[PDB]
Amino acid sequence: ATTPQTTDAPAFPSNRSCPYQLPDGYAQLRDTPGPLHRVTLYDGRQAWVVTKHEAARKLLGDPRLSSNRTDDNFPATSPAFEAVRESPQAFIGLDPPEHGTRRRMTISEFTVKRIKGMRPEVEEVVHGFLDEMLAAGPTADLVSQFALPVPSMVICRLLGVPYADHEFFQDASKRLVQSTDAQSALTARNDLAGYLDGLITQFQTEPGAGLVGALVADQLANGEIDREELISTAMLLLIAGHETTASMTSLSVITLLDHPEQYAALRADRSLVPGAVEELLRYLAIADIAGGRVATADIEVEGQLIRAGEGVIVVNSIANRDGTVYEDPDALDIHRSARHHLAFGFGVHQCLGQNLARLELEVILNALMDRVPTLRLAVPVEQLVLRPGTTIQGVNELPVTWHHHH
Ligand code: HEM
Ligand SMILES: O=C(O)c1ccccc1Nc1cccc(C(F)(F)F)c1
């Protein structure tokens, strides 16, 4: 090469170097005027990304932006995503009206009433794993010993997946979400699909509790959902149900320990916890791989033209750092109003599990402050290995220690 390498479509996604700040490239996008920006995906395709808060709400509500993953022009951010692409879709990949007919089969499990009613169960699960970790003595891996098991046990009960098989499906879920190549991603999905097919057949003998048992005994027995779809739907809920909250827990611990005055204020006044959870959601925005869209018609946005067949990624981490919405947006402030953040999306696909996630993180933070207020990282912040921007944000390992008490 013998010419400058500046490009008007930088590589996307980018990797975080700090868990709670944007990648520098993302900061550059945040500062570029306009709602949209060109980028180049891993294979060479260019696509649009959305980089401003209001425009992200508007485009997430635009029916000309389809969630159809199996569309040829759907933006793929890694060779692994094309596992979810050439696979039968759960409702996260459907458009209305099909999307609502499938999502409505699951919503009874996620109502505000039901979630509020799970609080004692979540508290029991959180405190049990906390006990086992603390009794095991420092040091510890917060991911394997706490952040992952807690939401796994909860979502497994919700679904009717037996927690006994946790080692299998927890490992399979890891391999699907984080793979760098396509085939290891396909294999993880097919191990999962295979396990899920057996559970249905098992339900097809003795009716079990949980959402999967319910969908087997009703919608499936009425032909209203296909077996492939039920598997896909159960897989989406299982994986989302435990990988997202696990990442929020580990990244929130890292973040709070870098803001000790806010963490101390939080411990001193537990009425701040719900607002702190909202702020952490806005600030950490762990699900950026959760904004892909493909346009089925030309879309004009503020003087820029999205043409039919162009991919669009609504990047909610950047949108949540829009300073015309959140004053001083790169500062963590558990007292701020984080209302209207996009960590959960917006519109018809807005996160089904959002209030379960909020409940989990409130109980988790309270239990950590109750039972191990001296928790600290057993390594410095820049000895941690963060995941790349091609997957759910977080850490695969979080070595922690505490002052032992008896
Ligand atoms: C803990 C933090 C969580 C975050 C930050 C998060 C983030 C998101 C985002 C951004 C979307 C939108 C995807 C899109 O627009 O294409 C989404 C959708 C979804 N989330 Fe969550 N999620 C979290 C927890 C959960 C939990 C605990 C569940 C439990 C099952 C869950 C289940 C779902 C489902 C099923 C959808 C698809 C909804 C639809 O397409 O109608 N999420 N999530
Ligand atoms: O997007 C799919 O189709 C998907 C399929 C199978 C399993 C998980 C899937 N998605 C997924 C995986 C992790 C976190 C989130 C989300 F952030 F949206 F909640 C979504």
Short mmCIF file of C-alpha atoms and ligand atoms in Angstrom, two decimals:
data_model
loop_
_atom_site.label_atom_id
_atom_site.label_comp_id
_atom_site.label_asym_id
_atom_site.label_seq_id
_atom_site.Cartn_x
_atom_site.Cartn_y
_atom_site.Cartn_z
CA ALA A 1 0.00 0.00 0.00
CA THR A 2 1.27 3.46 -0.93
CA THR A 3 -1.75 5.75 -0.41
CA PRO A 4 -3.48 6.95 2.79
CA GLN A 5 -5.82 4.41 4.37
CA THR A 6 -8.50 6.78 5.72
CA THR A 7 -11.98 5.40 5.04
CA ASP A 8 -15.46 6.81 5.14
CA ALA A 9 -16.88 3.46 6.34
CA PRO A 10 -14.79 2.26 9.30
CA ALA A 11 -14.75 -1.36 10.38
CA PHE A 12 -17.66 -2.34 12.60
CA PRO A 13 -18.20 -3.45 15.33
CA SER A 14 -15.29 -2.21 17.50
CA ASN A 15 -13.99 -3.68 20.75
CA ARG A 16 -14.27 -2.06 24.14
CA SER A 17 -11.04 -1.47 26.00
CA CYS A 18 -12.85 -0.12 29.07
CA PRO A 19 -16.01 -1.99 30.15
CA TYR A 20 -18.02 1.18 30.77
CA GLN A 21 -16.86 3.54 28.04
CA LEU A 22 -17.45 3.50 24.32
CA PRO A 23 -14.73 2.23 22.02
CA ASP A 24 -12.93 5.28 20.67
CA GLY A 25 -14.39 4.65 17.22
CA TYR A 26 -17.87 4.59 18.75
CA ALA A 27 -17.13 7.88 20.51
CA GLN A 28 -16.16 9.29 17.12
CA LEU A 29 -19.49 8.17 15.67
CA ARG A 30 -21.31 9.64 18.69
CA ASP A 31 -19.71 12.99 17.89
CA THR A 32 -20.29 12.89 14.12
CA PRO A 33 -23.32 15.02 13.18
CA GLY A 34 -26.25 13.18 11.74
CA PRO A 35 -28.27 10.16 12.78
CA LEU A 36 -26.55 7.69 10.43
CA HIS A 37 -23.05 6.61 9.50
CA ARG A 38 -21.52 4.22 6.99
CA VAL A 39 -19.47 1.26 8.25
CA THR A 40 -17.92 -1.87 6.75
CA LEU A 41 -18.84 -5.27 8.16
CA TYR A 42 -16.43 -8.19 8.50
CA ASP A 43 -17.11 -9.63 5.02
CA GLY A 44 -16.89 -6.35 3.08
CA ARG A 45 -20.51 -5.27 2.91
CA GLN A 46 -21.12 -1.70 3.88
CA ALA A 47 -24.04 -0.88 6.15
CA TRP A 48 -25.55 2.01 8.07
CA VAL A 49 -25.39 2.44 11.84
CA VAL A 50 -27.69 4.70 13.84
CA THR A 51 -25.82 6.90 16.30
CA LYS A 52 -28.37 9.30 17.86
CA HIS A 53 -31.12 8.73 20.43
CA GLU A 54 -34.30 10.11 18.84
CA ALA A 55 -33.44 8.76 15.40
CA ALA A 56 -32.88 5.34 16.97
CA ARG A 57 -36.40 5.42 18.45
CA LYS A 58 -37.82 6.48 15.09
CA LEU A 59 -36.04 3.82 13.03
CA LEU A 60 -36.83 1.09 15.57
CA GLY A 61 -40.49 1.92 15.03
CA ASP A 62 -40.26 2.08 11.25
CA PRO A 63 -42.01 -0.90 9.58
CA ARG A 64 -39.71 -0.45 6.55
CA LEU A 65 -36.85 -1.77 8.72
CA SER A 66 -37.31 -5.55 8.89
CA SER A 67 -35.90 -7.91 11.52
CA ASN A 68 -35.80 -10.73 8.95
CA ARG A 69 -32.41 -12.32 9.67
CA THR A 70 -32.82 -14.91 6.88
CA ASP A 71 -32.96 -12.06 4.32
CA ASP A 72 -29.87 -12.02 2.08
CA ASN A 73 -29.04 -8.37 2.83
CA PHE A 74 -29.45 -8.61 6.59
CA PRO A 75 -26.33 -7.11 8.24
CA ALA A 76 -24.10 -9.83 9.68
CA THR A 77 -21.43 -8.67 12.10
CA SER A 78 -19.36 -11.88 12.36
CA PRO A 79 -19.05 -15.28 10.63
CA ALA A 80 -20.83 -16.71 13.69
CA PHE A 81 -24.05 -14.69 13.36
CA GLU A 82 -24.84 -16.59 10.16
CA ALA A 83 -25.65 -19.42 12.51
CA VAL A 84 -28.74 -17.49 13.60
CA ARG A 85 -29.24 -16.41 9.98
CA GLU A 86 -29.57 -19.74 8.15
CA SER A 87 -31.62 -21.15 11.06
CA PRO A 88 -35.38 -21.19 11.71
CA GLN A 89 -36.23 -17.90 13.42
CA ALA A 90 -37.73 -17.18 16.82
CA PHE A 91 -40.00 -14.16 16.96
CA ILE A 92 -37.01 -11.81 17.44
CA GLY A 93 -36.47 -12.35 13.69
CA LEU A 94 -40.11 -11.91 12.62
CA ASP A 95 -42.00 -8.83 11.46
CA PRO A 96 -45.64 -8.01 12.24
CA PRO A 97 -48.08 -9.61 12.06
CA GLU A 98 -46.29 -12.96 12.57
CA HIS A 99 -44.13 -11.47 15.32
CA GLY A 100 -47.05 -10.70 17.61
CA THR A 101 -48.74 -14.07 17.19
CA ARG A 102 -45.56 -15.76 18.44
CA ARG A 103 -44.54 -13.24 21.11
CA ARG A 104 -48.05 -13.27 22.59
CA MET A 105 -47.56 -16.98 23.34
CA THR A 106 -44.86 -16.09 25.88
CA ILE A 107 -45.90 -12.80 27.46
CA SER A 108 -47.94 -14.24 30.35
CA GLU A 109 -44.61 -15.39 31.90
CA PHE A 110 -43.19 -11.82 31.89
CA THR A 111 -46.05 -9.61 33.12
CA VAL A 112 -45.31 -7.02 35.80
CA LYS A 113 -47.49 -9.02 38.20
CA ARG A 114 -45.66 -12.29 37.53
CA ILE A 115 -42.22 -10.69 37.79
CA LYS A 116 -43.01 -8.90 41.03
CA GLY A 117 -44.26 -12.28 42.31
CA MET A 118 -40.92 -13.94 41.54
CA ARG A 119 -39.02 -11.63 43.89
CA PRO A 120 -38.86 -14.12 46.82
CA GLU A 121 -37.66 -16.87 44.45
CA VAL A 122 -34.98 -14.63 42.96
CA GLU A 123 -33.82 -13.57 46.43
CA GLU A 124 -33.53 -17.25 47.46
CA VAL A 125 -31.50 -18.12 44.34
CA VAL A 126 -29.22 -15.09 44.72
CA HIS A 127 -28.51 -15.74 48.39
CA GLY A 128 -27.96 -19.47 47.90
CA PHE A 129 -25.24 -19.08 45.30
CA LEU A 130 -23.79 -16.20 47.35
CA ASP A 131 -23.58 -18.52 50.38
CA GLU A 132 -21.86 -21.24 48.37
CA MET A 133 -19.34 -18.79 46.91
CA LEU A 134 -18.54 -17.12 50.23
CA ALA A 135 -18.39 -20.40 52.15
CA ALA A 136 -15.98 -21.65 49.47
CA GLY A 137 -13.74 -18.75 50.53
CA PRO A 138 -11.77 -16.24 48.47
CA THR A 139 -10.73 -15.91 45.84
CA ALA A 140 -13.55 -16.71 43.41
CA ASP A 141 -14.67 -16.37 39.79
CA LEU A 142 -17.78 -14.22 39.96
CA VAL A 143 -18.91 -15.31 36.48
CA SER A 144 -18.91 -19.09 36.92
CA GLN A 145 -19.82 -19.02 40.62
CA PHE A 146 -22.55 -16.38 40.76
CA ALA A 147 -23.31 -14.08 37.82
CA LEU A 148 -24.20 -16.97 35.50
CA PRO A 149 -25.85 -19.56 37.79
CA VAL A 150 -28.34 -17.11 39.34
CA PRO A 151 -30.17 -16.05 36.14
CA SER A 152 -29.80 -19.57 34.75
CA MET A 153 -31.66 -21.15 37.65
CA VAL A 154 -34.37 -18.47 37.40
CA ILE A 155 -34.95 -18.75 33.64
CA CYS A 156 -34.77 -22.55 33.78
CA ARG A 157 -37.67 -22.56 36.28
CA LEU A 158 -39.60 -20.08 34.15
CA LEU A 159 -39.22 -22.31 31.08
CA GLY A 160 -39.40 -25.75 32.66
CA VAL A 161 -35.82 -26.60 31.68
CA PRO A 162 -34.36 -28.85 34.41
CA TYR A 163 -31.43 -27.12 36.06
CA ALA A 164 -29.69 -30.50 36.42
CA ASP A 165 -28.56 -30.23 32.80
CA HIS A 166 -27.09 -26.77 33.46
CA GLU A 167 -23.50 -27.73 32.64
CA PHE A 168 -24.59 -28.90 29.18
CA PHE A 169 -26.72 -25.97 28.16
CA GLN A 170 -24.69 -23.30 29.94
CA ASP A 171 -21.63 -24.50 28.02
CA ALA A 172 -23.59 -24.76 24.75
CA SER A 173 -24.97 -21.24 25.23
CA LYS A 174 -21.43 -19.91 25.72
CA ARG A 175 -20.26 -21.54 22.48
CA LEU A 176 -23.16 -20.10 20.45
CA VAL A 177 -22.90 -16.49 21.57
CA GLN A 178 -19.12 -16.02 21.40
CA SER A 179 -17.80 -18.16 18.51
CA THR A 180 -15.52 -16.54 15.94
CA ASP A 181 -16.25 -18.99 13.12
CA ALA A 182 -19.58 -20.13 11.73
CA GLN A 183 -19.38 -23.89 12.26
CA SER A 184 -18.66 -23.80 15.99
CA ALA A 185 -21.69 -21.50 16.23
CA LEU A 186 -23.85 -23.89 14.17
CA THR A 187 -22.75 -26.80 16.35
CA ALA A 188 -23.67 -25.02 19.58
CA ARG A 189 -27.12 -24.21 18.19
CA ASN A 190 -27.63 -27.81 17.09
CA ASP A 191 -26.54 -29.24 20.43
CA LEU A 192 -29.06 -26.79 21.91
CA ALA A 193 -31.74 -27.55 19.31
CA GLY A 194 -31.07 -31.24 19.92
CA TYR A 195 -31.40 -30.94 23.69
CA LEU A 196 -34.55 -28.86 23.25
CA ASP A 197 -36.15 -31.38 20.87
CA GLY A 198 -35.65 -34.14 23.44
CA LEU A 199 -37.21 -32.04 26.19
CA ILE A 200 -40.30 -31.42 24.04
CA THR A 201 -40.58 -35.15 23.29
CA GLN A 202 -40.21 -35.65 27.04
CA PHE A 203 -42.98 -33.10 27.53
CA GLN A 204 -44.81 -34.98 24.77
CA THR A 205 -44.99 -37.84 27.33
CA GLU A 206 -45.51 -36.22 30.76
CA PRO A 207 -46.78 -32.59 30.90
CA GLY A 208 -44.23 -30.56 32.79
CA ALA A 209 -44.49 -27.13 34.32
CA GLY A 210 -42.97 -24.04 32.77
CA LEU A 211 -43.51 -22.18 29.54
CA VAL A 212 -42.11 -24.97 27.36
CA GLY A 213 -44.44 -27.48 28.98
CA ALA A 214 -47.33 -25.07 28.40
CA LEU A 215 -46.49 -24.42 24.73
CA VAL A 216 -46.15 -28.19 24.20
CA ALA A 217 -49.53 -28.98 25.74
CA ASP A 218 -51.47 -26.16 24.05
CA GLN A 219 -50.14 -24.25 21.04
CA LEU A 220 -48.07 -27.14 19.70
CA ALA A 221 -50.94 -29.63 20.15
CA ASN A 222 -53.15 -27.21 18.16
CA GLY A 223 -50.70 -26.74 15.30
CA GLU A 224 -50.41 -23.07 16.17
CA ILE A 225 -46.62 -23.29 16.49
CA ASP A 226 -44.29 -25.73 14.72
CA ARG A 227 -41.80 -27.88 16.63
CA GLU A 228 -38.86 -26.02 15.04
CA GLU A 229 -40.36 -22.71 16.17
CA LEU A 230 -40.95 -23.90 19.73
CA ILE A 231 -37.31 -25.03 19.90
CA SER A 232 -36.11 -21.70 18.50
CA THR A 233 -38.35 -19.79 20.89
CA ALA A 234 -37.19 -21.77 23.90
CA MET A 235 -33.57 -21.33 22.78
CA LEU A 236 -33.90 -17.55 22.47
CA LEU A 237 -35.43 -17.23 25.94
CA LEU A 238 -32.97 -19.63 27.56
CA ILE A 239 -29.89 -17.91 26.12
CA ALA A 240 -31.12 -14.35 26.56
CA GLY A 241 -32.44 -15.19 30.02
CA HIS A 242 -29.07 -16.01 31.40
CA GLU A 243 -26.33 -14.45 29.22
CA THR A 244 -27.65 -10.86 29.40
CA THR A 245 -28.15 -10.68 33.16
CA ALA A 246 -24.87 -12.49 33.77
CA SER A 247 -23.07 -9.78 31.79
CA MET A 248 -24.91 -6.96 33.53
CA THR A 249 -23.93 -8.38 36.91
CA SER A 250 -20.22 -8.77 36.16
CA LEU A 251 -19.90 -5.48 34.29
CA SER A 252 -21.88 -3.63 36.95
CA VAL A 253 -19.54 -4.92 39.66
CA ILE A 254 -16.50 -3.76 37.67
CA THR A 255 -18.14 -0.38 37.07
CA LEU A 256 -19.32 0.28 40.63
CA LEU A 257 -15.88 -0.57 41.98
CA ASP A 258 -14.43 2.21 39.79
CA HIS A 259 -16.97 4.69 41.24
CA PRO A 260 -16.61 4.01 44.97
CA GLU A 261 -18.45 7.12 46.15
CA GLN A 262 -21.54 6.26 44.11
CA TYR A 263 -21.31 2.62 45.21
CA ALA A 264 -21.04 3.78 48.82
CA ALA A 265 -23.98 6.16 48.39
CA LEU A 266 -25.92 3.21 46.96
CA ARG A 267 -25.07 0.98 49.91
CA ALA A 268 -26.13 3.77 52.29
CA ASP A 269 -29.58 4.27 50.71
CA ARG A 270 -31.15 1.20 49.12
CA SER A 271 -34.02 3.30 47.78
CA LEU A 272 -31.45 4.36 45.15
CA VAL A 273 -31.03 0.80 43.81
CA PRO A 274 -33.80 0.90 41.15
CA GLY A 275 -32.49 4.16 39.71
CA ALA A 276 -28.95 2.84 39.87
CA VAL A 277 -30.03 -0.23 37.89
CA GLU A 278 -31.57 2.00 35.20
CA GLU A 279 -28.40 4.08 35.01
CA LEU A 280 -26.19 0.98 34.77
CA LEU A 281 -28.45 -0.34 31.97
CA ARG A 282 -28.12 2.89 30.00
CA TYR A 283 -24.40 3.19 30.68
CA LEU A 284 -23.30 -0.39 30.03
CA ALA A 285 -25.63 -1.12 27.08
CA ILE A 286 -24.45 -4.71 26.78
CA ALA A 287 -26.61 -5.78 23.78
CA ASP A 288 -25.39 -3.91 20.70
CA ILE A 289 -25.55 -7.06 18.51
CA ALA A 290 -29.29 -6.58 19.12
CA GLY A 291 -29.99 -3.82 16.66
CA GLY A 292 -29.71 -5.35 13.18
CA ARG A 293 -32.30 -4.36 10.57
CA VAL A 294 -32.63 -4.54 6.78
CA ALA A 295 -34.58 -1.95 4.81
CA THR A 296 -37.33 -3.20 2.50
CA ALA A 297 -37.95 0.26 1.00
CA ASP A 298 -36.11 3.54 0.71
CA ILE A 299 -36.03 5.48 3.98
CA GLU A 300 -35.22 9.18 4.22
CA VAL A 301 -33.72 10.19 7.58
CA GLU A 302 -32.76 13.82 8.26
CA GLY A 303 -31.22 14.29 4.81
CA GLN A 304 -29.72 10.81 4.36
CA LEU A 305 -31.21 8.01 2.27
CA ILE A 306 -31.38 4.36 3.33
CA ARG A 307 -32.07 2.38 0.18
CA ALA A 308 -34.03 -0.86 0.03
CA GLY A 309 -31.67 -3.72 0.75
CA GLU A 310 -29.17 -1.73 2.79
CA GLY A 311 -28.44 -3.01 6.28
CA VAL A 312 -28.97 -0.84 9.35
CA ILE A 313 -27.69 -1.41 12.91
CA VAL A 314 -29.27 0.62 15.71
CA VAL A 315 -26.33 0.88 18.13
CA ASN A 316 -27.99 1.58 21.46
CA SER A 317 -24.73 2.04 23.38
CA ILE A 318 -23.91 5.07 21.25
CA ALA A 319 -27.53 6.22 21.28
CA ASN A 320 -27.50 6.05 25.10
CA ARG A 321 -24.51 8.45 25.17
CA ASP A 322 -26.43 11.15 23.24
CA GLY A 323 -25.71 14.32 25.20
CA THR A 324 -28.86 16.10 24.04
CA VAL A 325 -30.80 13.51 26.05
CA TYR A 326 -28.49 12.52 28.96
CA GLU A 327 -26.65 15.51 30.42
CA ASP A 328 -22.94 14.74 30.63
CA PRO A 329 -23.64 11.33 29.05
CA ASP A 330 -20.27 9.64 29.64
CA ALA A 331 -20.53 10.18 33.39
CA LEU A 332 -22.02 7.49 35.63
CA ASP A 333 -24.65 9.13 37.85
CA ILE A 334 -26.97 6.83 39.77
CA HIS A 335 -29.03 9.88 40.69
CA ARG A 336 -29.71 10.93 37.10
CA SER A 337 -32.90 10.25 35.20
CA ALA A 338 -32.00 7.47 32.77
CA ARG A 339 -35.61 7.33 31.52
CA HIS A 340 -36.08 6.41 27.84
CA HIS A 341 -32.69 4.71 27.41
CA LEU A 342 -32.39 2.18 24.61
CA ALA A 343 -30.49 -0.61 26.38
CA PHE A 344 -33.65 -2.74 25.88
CA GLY A 345 -34.55 -1.44 22.44
CA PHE A 346 -37.84 0.22 21.59
CA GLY A 347 -40.96 -0.63 19.64
CA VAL A 348 -42.44 -4.01 18.84
CA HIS A 349 -39.21 -5.92 19.67
CA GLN A 350 -38.46 -4.07 22.91
CA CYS A 351 -36.94 -6.59 25.35
CA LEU A 352 -39.47 -9.15 26.62
CA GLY A 353 -37.37 -9.86 29.72
CA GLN A 354 -36.60 -6.28 30.74
CA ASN A 355 -38.46 -6.32 34.04
CA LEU A 356 -37.04 -9.72 34.97
CA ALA A 357 -33.61 -8.27 34.30
CA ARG A 358 -34.39 -5.21 36.42
CA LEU A 359 -35.67 -7.41 39.26
CA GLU A 360 -32.63 -9.68 39.09
CA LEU A 361 -30.13 -6.82 39.12
CA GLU A 362 -31.88 -5.04 42.03
CA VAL A 363 -31.81 -8.22 44.15
CA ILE A 364 -28.21 -8.96 43.12
CA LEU A 365 -26.83 -5.52 44.01
CA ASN A 366 -28.69 -5.48 47.32
CA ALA A 367 -27.43 -8.97 48.17
CA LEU A 368 -23.83 -8.12 47.26
CA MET A 369 -23.93 -5.00 49.46
CA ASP A 370 -25.63 -6.93 52.29
CA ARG A 371 -23.41 -9.99 52.30
CA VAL A 372 -20.05 -8.98 50.81
CA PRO A 373 -19.57 -5.19 50.98
CA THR A 374 -15.78 -5.71 50.79
CA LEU A 375 -15.93 -7.46 47.41
CA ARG A 376 -13.10 -6.23 45.19
CA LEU A 377 -11.31 -7.28 42.02
CA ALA A 378 -8.49 -9.78 42.63
CA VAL A 379 -6.68 -8.31 39.59
CA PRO A 380 -6.34 -4.77 38.22
CA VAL A 381 -8.97 -3.55 35.78
CA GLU A 382 -6.65 -3.92 32.77
CA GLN A 383 -5.80 -7.54 33.51
CA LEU A 384 -9.41 -8.40 32.59
CA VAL A 385 -10.25 -9.90 29.19
CA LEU A 386 -13.36 -8.26 27.72
CA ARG A 387 -15.41 -9.86 24.98
CA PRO A 388 -15.21 -8.38 21.46
CA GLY A 389 -17.92 -6.11 20.08
CA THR A 390 -19.30 -8.97 17.95
CA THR A 391 -21.13 -10.50 20.91
CA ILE A 392 -22.88 -9.60 24.16
CA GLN A 393 -20.52 -7.38 26.17
CA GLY A 394 -18.95 -8.73 29.33
CA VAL A 395 -16.06 -10.76 30.70
CA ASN A 396 -15.52 -14.50 30.57
CA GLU A 397 -13.82 -14.40 33.98
CA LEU A 398 -13.97 -11.98 36.93
CA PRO A 399 -11.50 -12.90 39.68
CA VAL A 400 -12.74 -11.34 42.92
CA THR A 401 -11.81 -11.50 46.58
CA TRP A 402 -13.10 -10.04 49.83
CA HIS A 403 -12.21 -9.57 53.48
CA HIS A 404 -13.18 -12.90 55.01
CA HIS A 405 -15.65 -12.92 57.92
CA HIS A 406 -17.08 -15.80 59.82
C1 HEM B 1 -30.19 -8.04 31.28
C2 HEM B 1 -30.20 -7.10 30.33
C3 HEM B 1 -30.89 -7.26 28.95
C4 HEM B 1 -30.63 -6.44 27.93
C5 HEM B 1 -29.63 -5.25 27.98
C6 HEM B 1 -31.42 -6.88 26.81
C7 HEM B 1 -31.44 -6.26 25.59
C8 HEM B 1 -32.34 -6.52 24.59
C9 HEM B 1 -32.51 -5.77 23.37
C10 HEM B 1 -31.69 -4.53 22.94
C11 HEM B 1 -33.48 -6.33 22.65
C12 HEM B 1 -34.02 -5.83 21.25
C13 HEM B 1 -33.57 -6.68 20.08
C14 HEM B 1 -34.04 -6.09 18.76
O1 HEM B 1 -34.62 -4.96 18.73
O2 HEM B 1 -33.85 -6.76 17.72
C15 HEM B 1 -33.98 -7.46 23.40
C16 HEM B 1 -35.00 -8.30 23.00
C17 HEM B 1 -35.37 -9.44 23.64
N1 HEM B 1 -34.95 -9.82 24.92
FE1 HEM B 1 -33.74 -8.80 26.12
N2 HEM B 1 -32.18 -7.98 27.19
C18 HEM B 1 -31.86 -8.24 28.52
C19 HEM B 1 -32.43 -9.25 29.27
C20 HEM B 1 -33.33 -10.18 28.79
C21 HEM B 1 -33.89 -11.28 29.56
C22 HEM B 1 -33.55 -11.60 31.03
C23 HEM B 1 -34.69 -11.99 28.76
C24 HEM B 1 -35.45 -13.24 29.23
C25 HEM B 1 -35.93 -14.15 28.41
C26 HEM B 1 -34.70 -11.35 27.46
C27 HEM B 1 -35.43 -11.74 26.36
C28 HEM B 1 -35.57 -11.03 25.18
C29 HEM B 1 -36.39 -11.40 24.04
C30 HEM B 1 -37.28 -12.65 23.89
C31 HEM B 1 -36.28 -10.43 23.11
C32 HEM B 1 -36.94 -10.38 21.71
C33 HEM B 1 -38.21 -9.57 21.80
C34 HEM B 1 -38.89 -9.45 20.47
O3 HEM B 1 -38.21 -9.58 19.41
O4 HEM B 1 -40.12 -9.24 20.46
N3 HEM B 1 -33.86 -10.26 27.54
N4 HEM B 1 -33.27 -7.54 24.58
O1 LIG B 2 -31.21 -13.50 18.05
C1 LIG B 2 -31.58 -14.69 17.98
O2 LIG B 2 -32.26 -15.19 17.05
C2 LIG B 2 -31.17 -15.66 19.07
C3 LIG B 2 -31.36 -17.01 18.77
C4 LIG B 2 -31.03 -18.02 19.65
C5 LIG B 2 -30.51 -17.68 20.89
C6 LIG B 2 -30.31 -16.35 21.21
C7 LIG B 2 -30.63 -15.30 20.33
N1 LIG B 2 -30.46 -13.96 20.62
C8 LIG B 2 -29.95 -13.31 21.73
C9 LIG B 2 -28.86 -13.77 22.49
C10 LIG B 2 -28.41 -13.06 23.59
C11 LIG B 2 -29.00 -11.87 23.98
C12 LIG B 2 -30.08 -11.39 23.23
C13 LIG B 2 -30.76 -10.11 23.60
F1 LIG B 2 -29.91 -9.11 23.86
F2 LIG B 2 -31.53 -9.65 22.61
F3 LIG B 2 -31.54 -10.23 24.69
C14 LIG B 2 -30.55 -12.10 22.12
#
